[PDB]
């Protein structure tokens, strides 16, 4: 865990940084100007105040400024004050402090969102970001519970959107700043936590830091800082996002040193599967969906397919069950089941078929069809060295191949992250005329699922995917294979398209998602479930996910403009699976609560080539 110390008093910067790093913190959040040194910018005589305005940049090394210091805006700077003089002075001082932080090369800057109206703050920040070259991130310091809702009930004549308030503050701020990459959240966790769906909306936001006052810590029977189980659960959820924890306030457990607040967080970090190990480095990283039909995959692309043992275990079990079903034990030694592995790859599904027929003690005559001429090299070396006459390697497309006989089972592996975005229906359509009339296809059927999601980081990633020499908004009309991690799912998945083999592959689906939260919709995450044989299934749907099976990430269909949704407002989306003789594509459009345009008309931004 990486953790920092928020201090509003730095009498000496080298001594304080040494003492902070001595007790284990990795950075120091400190004011670059004196928090009480209010400056005047318009009116004399205080405008012409002499001397240095702040302390020198030569007190730390340049790398110390660039790595170890997070700057803070001064508390008196109120750019949204209703007094015009205070407003102008605070605009000028905000600009001066931000420019000094850019001059220092600070990695981050903390600014506060402690009130509803922060439009002028947003404008001065948006103008700073578009001026000069600087790389600093801006951590908007926003509470989990508004400060006026945390006060004690001790005012006799003033007794004490309640929970969804400060998220509305942050949402308005980052919407004014046009969803900048450089503006993120530093979340203040208070003594009283909100409900679990409020914590889910926050967890789908660009949270780069979490602010933990020492006053939210409880005390042991031995007298040590600890946190409640609801706080610990919040800490455990934030540790998934790899946020940094900032400790504020003073040492409220004065008997032991201030190291103990940090030691408890280290304890919880050291006390929090194979999919999560495989998926590291790929979270919220958009990559294009594979198109094996019109692109020849590299060998390293096939290598990560063969690296999943659960998928091929399931295929071997499905072939096992089908072989037992189609051959009685009395006719075991004289019935030859003609199998055809379609899109044989570099081997692994043919190996699964052979192992299945061995453990079923059945006789198969296998055909391994593959159109990739470079994987046919691997297949034919396999056949020469191991398989022999049992396997006939065909270098053809299943849709144009002329088989010498009909198959009992056809086995394919043509499923994408959304189950049909790799033209499995179109390919298995052309591979039915050499299937026997009692013949079996594996997978037998497959369904795709969609769920509405919210993610500011995914939305900014899709915007960052803008390319020159193309439509400036085509990046919102492509699906992305993404290990979507920093996101909020607004409703349960529902089935979109179903294909069953052996069998028009054009489809139209309308899905209505009941919403119980107050979010901003950014796209739809698509999953799939497939039945290979009777009870043998492969699923990437996050409720029925096959354990440790990492062949498929979810798919993501973005929308061009985010759609703000409120409670009790269902989201109605419509998906089309469209095609012609040449191409296949998807179109989608949100129709409730607010219509959006049809995304990807005619496959203008994304097609799958037949």
């Amino acid at each position: 865990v990486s953790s920092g110390r928020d201090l509003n008093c730095v009498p000496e910067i080298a001594d304080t940084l040494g003492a902070v790093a001595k007790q284990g913190f990795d950075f120091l959040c400190m004011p670059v100007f004196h928090p009480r040194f209010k400056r005047e910018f318009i009116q004399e005589p205080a405008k012409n105040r002499p001397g240095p305005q702040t302390r020198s940049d030569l007190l730390l090394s340049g790398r110390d400024w660039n790595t170890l210091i997070v700057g803070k805006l001064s508390p008196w700077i109120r750019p949204d004050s209703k007094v015009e003089k205070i407003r102008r002075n605070s605009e000028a001082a905000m600009l001066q402090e931000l420019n000094f932080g850019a001059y220092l090369g600070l990695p981050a800057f903390l600014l506060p969102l402690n009130q509803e109206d922060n439009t002028n703050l947003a404008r001065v920040l948006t103008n700073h970001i578009h001026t000069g070259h600087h790389s600093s991130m801006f951590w908007m310091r926003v509470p989990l519970v508004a400060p006026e809702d945390l006060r004690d009930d001790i005012i006799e004549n003033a007794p004490t959107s309640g929970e969804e308030k400060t998220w509305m503050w942050w949402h308005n701020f980052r919407t004014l700043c046009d969803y900048s990459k450089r503006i993120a959240v530093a979340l203040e966790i208070g003594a009283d936590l909100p409900s679990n769906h409020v914590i889910d909306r926050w967890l789908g936001e660009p949270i780069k830091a979490a602010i933990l006052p020492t006053s939210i810590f409880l005390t042991n029977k031995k007298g040590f800082p600890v946190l409640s189980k609801m706080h610990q659960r919040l800490i455990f959820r934030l540790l998934k996002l790899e946020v940094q924890f900032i400790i504020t306030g003073t040492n409220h457990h004065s008997e032991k040193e201030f190291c103990s607040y940090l030691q408890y967080l280290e304890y919880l970090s050291q006390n929090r599967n194979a999919y999560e190990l495989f998926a590291k480095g790929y979270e919220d990283y958009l990559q294009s969906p594979l198109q094996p039909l019109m692109d020849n995959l590299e060998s390293q692309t096939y290598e990560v397919f063969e690296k999943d043992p659960i998928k091929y275990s399931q295929y071997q079990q499905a072939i096992y069950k089908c072989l037992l079903d189609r051959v009685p034990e009395e006719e075991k030694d004289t019935n030859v089941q003609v199998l055809m592995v379609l899109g044989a790859g570099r081997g692994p599904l043919v190996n699964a078929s052979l192992r299945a027929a061995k453990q079923a003690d059945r006789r198969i005559k296998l055909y391994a069809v593959e159109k990739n001429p470079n994987a046919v090299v691997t297949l034919e070396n396999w056949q020469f060295e191991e398989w022999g006459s049992q396997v006939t390697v065909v270098s053809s497309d299943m849709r144009e191949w002329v088989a010498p006989e009909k198959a009992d089972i056809i086995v394919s592996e043509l499923l994408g992250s959304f189950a049909d975005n790799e033209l499995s229906p179109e390919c298995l359509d052309g591979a039915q005329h050499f299937l026997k009339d009692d013949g079996v296809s594996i997978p037998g059927e497959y369904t795709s699922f969609l769920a509405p999601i919210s993610s500011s980081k995914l939305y900014n990633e899709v915007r960052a995917c803008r390319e020159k020499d193309r439509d400036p908004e085509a990046q919102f009309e492509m699906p992305y294979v993404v290990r979507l991690h920093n996101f909020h799912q607004l409703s349960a998945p529902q089935p979109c398209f179903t294909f069953s083999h052996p069998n028009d592959n054009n489809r139209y689906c309308t899905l209505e998602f009941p919403v119980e939260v107050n979010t901003v919709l950014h796209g739809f995450a698509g999953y799939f479930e497939t039945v290979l044989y009777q009870d043998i299934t492969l699923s990437i749907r996050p409720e029925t996910h096959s354990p440790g099976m990492f062949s498929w990430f979810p798919i993501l269909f973005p929308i061009k403009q985010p759609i703000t949704v409120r409670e009790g407002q269902t989201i109605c989306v419509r998906f089309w699976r469209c095609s012609n003789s040449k191409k296949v594509w998807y179109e989608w459009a949100v129709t409730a609560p607010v219509c959006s345009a049809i995304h990807n008309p005619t496959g203008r931004s994304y097609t799958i080539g037949l």
Partner: peptide, 6 residues
């Protein structure tokens, strides 16, 4: 590239 993505 992983998860059926390039």
């Amino acid at each position: 590239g992983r998860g059926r993505g390039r």
